Design an enzyme around this catalytic site. Structure first.
Site, PDB file in Angstrom:
ATOM      1  N   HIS A 166       6.335  -4.503   6.297  1.00  0.00           N
ATOM      2  CA  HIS A 166       5.418  -3.539   6.791  1.00  0.00           C
ATOM      3  C   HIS A 166       6.050  -2.794   7.926  1.00  0.00           C
ATOM      4  O   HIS A 166       6.865  -3.242   8.536  1.00  0.00           O
ATOM      5  CB  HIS A 166       4.276  -4.210   7.306  1.00  0.00           C
ATOM      6  CG  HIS A 166       3.154  -4.772   6.321  1.00  0.00           C
ATOM      7  ND1 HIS A 166       2.892  -6.122   6.316  1.00  0.00           N
ATOM      8  CD2 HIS A 166       2.836  -4.255   5.038  1.00  0.00           C
ATOM      9  CE1 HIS A 166       2.280  -6.449   5.313  1.00  0.00           C
ATOM     10  NE2 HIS A 166       1.994  -5.354   4.617  1.00  0.00           N
ATOM     11  N   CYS A 267      -1.561  -9.048  12.192  1.00  0.00           N
ATOM     12  CA  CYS A 267      -2.024  -9.317  10.905  1.00  0.00           C
ATOM     13  C   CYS A 267      -3.373 -10.080  10.625  1.00  0.00           C
ATOM     14  O   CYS A 267      -4.126  -9.984   9.727  1.00  0.00           O
ATOM     15  CB  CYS A 267      -0.818  -9.908   9.950  1.00  0.00           C
ATOM     16  SG  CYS A 267       0.638  -8.884  10.157  1.00  0.00           S
TER      17      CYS A 267
END
EC number: 3.5.3.18
Length: 274
Positions: A166, A267
């Site tokens: 990511h 996250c």
């Protein structure tokens, strides 16, 4: 507006299946589940007990090994929540419980239903002034377009994500106008691209370990600018960089076990300002 302000936070418990079944790019040391649970517990403890955020804890779903990483399923900006369609098929069902939780938090919900659109919240970096969205194997152009249409008040720019899962695998906001960034060839190229697409000049906090560039910045009444960062035990050289920040209230938080399954600090939570 007051960047980093939050009043609530959504988190989700770890399923036993995460240990062996959670997706991961590196096949290294196995996950110590008991320890992962403790790291998550302390993480939630800091956000709720210490910082005072109202915590919404969702139950684990054994059929969703990655359900702990709530950030990938929802992007919240002000009073609006975008329920994403994760790039990984085995994580699509995670949107069900997140949608219900955010509905109860009274947010305006927008669902990403396009069968051709994918977006992981982990690929989204909101600076407070604009959005930078990483185009990776988890997020595509159509997904980024839907995010842009959802948050019309802000500019949305895309950046290629290579050699990383990511965009936030190597960056995150460390302050109102401060971007924490890794030192790898890949991270530096992405940074240059982001600064090239913005008329606003951002300050940078450069760290030697890419994954240590992922931290959680919060503006809390009675505490001020707070920064949750990786510990010296986990990344000694990067911790030294964070420790120079006498202008923040620093809180070291362990995350070694979740990183084994590609989950960094941001996250495991979705921050909301009510």
């Amino acid at each position: 507006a007051t960047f980093g302000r939050a009043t609530h936070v959504v988190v989700r418990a770890l399923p036993e299946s995460l240990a062996q079944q959670a997706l991961r790019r590196t096949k290294g040391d196995e996950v110590d589940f008991a320890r992962a649970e403790r790291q998550h517990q302390l993480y939630v403890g800091v956000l709720g007990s210490k910082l005072g955020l109202q915590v919404v804890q969702l139950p684990a779903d054994e059929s969703l090994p990655d359900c702990v990483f709530v950030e990938d399923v929802a992007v919240v900006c002000e009073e609006t929540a975008l329920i994403t369609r994760p790039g990984a098929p085995s994580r699509r069902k995670e949107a069900d419980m997140m949608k219900e939780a955010l509905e109860k938090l009274q947010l305006n919900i927008v669902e990403m239903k396009d069968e051709n659109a994918t977006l992981d919240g982990g690929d989204v970096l909101f600076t407070g002034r604009e959005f930078f969205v990483g185009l990776s194997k988890r997020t595509n152009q159509r997904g980024a377009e839907i995010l842009a249409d959802t948050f019309k008040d802000y500019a949305v720019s895309t950046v290629p994500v290579v050699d990383a899962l990511h965009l936030k695998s190597f960056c995150s906001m460390a302050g109102p106008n401060l971007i924490a960034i890794g030192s790898s060839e890949s991270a530096q190229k992405a940074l240059k691209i982001m600064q090239q697409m913005s008329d606003h000049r951002y300050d940078k906090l450069t760290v030697p370990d890419d994954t240590a560039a992922n931290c959680i910045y919060l503006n809390i009444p009675s505490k001020g600018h707070v920064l949750l960062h990786r510990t010296p035990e986990e990344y000694p050289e990067s911790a030294k960089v964070y420790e120079k920040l006498k202008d923040h209230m620093l809180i070291p938080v362990s995350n070694s076990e979740l990183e084994k399954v590609d989950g960094l600090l941001t996250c495991s939570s979705v921050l909301i300002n009510k």
